[PDB]
Amino acid sequence: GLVPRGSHMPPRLQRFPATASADEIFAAFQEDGCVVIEGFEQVARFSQEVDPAMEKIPVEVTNNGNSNDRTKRFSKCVIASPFRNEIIESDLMHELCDRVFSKPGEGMGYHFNDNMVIEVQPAPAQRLHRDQELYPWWNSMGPAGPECLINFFCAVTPFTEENGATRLVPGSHLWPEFTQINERDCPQFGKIETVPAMQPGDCYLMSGKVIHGAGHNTTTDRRRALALSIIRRELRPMQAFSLSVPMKLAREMSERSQTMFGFRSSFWGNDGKDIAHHLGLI
């Protein structure tokens, strides 16, 4: 008795506590392409730390169909928030990444693509898209292809259906053909059943194959999010973290986090040697 008996049931979107087993969350990730992780205070210290840089972002009102139309985005999160000390060291984050990406005896098969705070000003709904469209050939491999990208999308201010929270399409990672989602390329355009995604500090772990998009935003609510995009070791990051994150901060990171930001190798080597030698990190 989850929907009134006889009702059409909407797409399934499982929810796990931040204390749940990694293999339990992972089976739900494979089943639907996305899961919620409730509980993934630290969220408050972070928002306050990033709030000044947020305030120095002017808003554009363009009615252009762009993703910048009344949506604020900021990436220098390691520079701006002592995040770089607590948030990225989730032993469950790595627990999941290592199940999605790593192979036995290659160590870490993953690293960071971006660390982005997204704040939808009260803004047209984002176009529906797969994240893996960032690597434009991936869709051509269809649902049999390997994962390139997963996203720990974390709520900062709460996610109402009013402030424009992300609308996810669970199960779109198993559709036979992966297309652009528009009226010309997507036969299912307009019949696509979305499910809106949430309280601060909770994260939904989404595959790069799942259709989704930010909805329309209210009068007062700036709905703020924090995206942890993590990609295959073989793919290139959107952010050049090891060129803009200062060496002072890289020295305080763990071996595994230096790898996530490319201050360390596992690809991205230095003539047969780990790049961390030449940088002075033993």
Add this chain to the structure above:
Amino acid sequence: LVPGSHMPPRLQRFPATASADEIFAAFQEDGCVVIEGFISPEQVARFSQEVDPAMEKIPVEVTNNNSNDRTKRFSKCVIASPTFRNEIIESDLMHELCDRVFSKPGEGMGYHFNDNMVIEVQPGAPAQRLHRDQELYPWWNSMGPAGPECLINFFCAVTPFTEENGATRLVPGSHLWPEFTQINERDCPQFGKIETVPAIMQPGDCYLMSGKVIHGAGHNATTTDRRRALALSIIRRELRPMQAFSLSVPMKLAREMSERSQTMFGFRSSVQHCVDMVHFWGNDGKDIAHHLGLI
């Protein structure tokens, strides 16, 4: 020609003064093309000389094995060779050809360096296993010949490439087979039945090869011939390089690069359009070359 004698596969040859369009058409037909005089004889000789000290401090590895040993590999070419960083990577024919492969309309350079590797095959080095270079990106074969290009290689003769000294063995038109598998006994049904052809080249000649082309370094059946090559490996802007050039190449040398050379090594971003635009390998909305100081 040969005498009813079987005729081995055709590897096309062009001079470096041929138009990029004629070379590219042959590249598309066959997946590989020789560009003669890709580098001048005087440039190759100066490059060979400028890296030779580094090439002499590299110990030859000999092992008890089928593991691509007795092959020196050196990648600090920008640091060690002014002829390389000031002249070789500024080949316009190289960039002309890279655009025809990689660059989408209105998104700038679609490509950057994966590696710059001197490969010196020692006397007696065993032959390499037949392989496609895009096996580096393990999912790529699964898109088969319809797939987009992962990488191309400008593989230049620094010293002569002969059949005896281990010039690369190529399989022209293997970029067009219907199934791309690893080349082993379990997965490849033509295993042991694959016809190769060597890349016979003088110094400064190069071949240009798709990642979809099966190939392998031959066996060096000489006693005194160290067969040297310079591999300029070039990948799509969305793929990760094997060398972290922006972290080991010094900024002194970065400031003396053209903007397109800076982009090749990750000292500068390229802008991909998806509705939306995004500087790839950027800095929170801006080109990374601002924070690095390159303007």
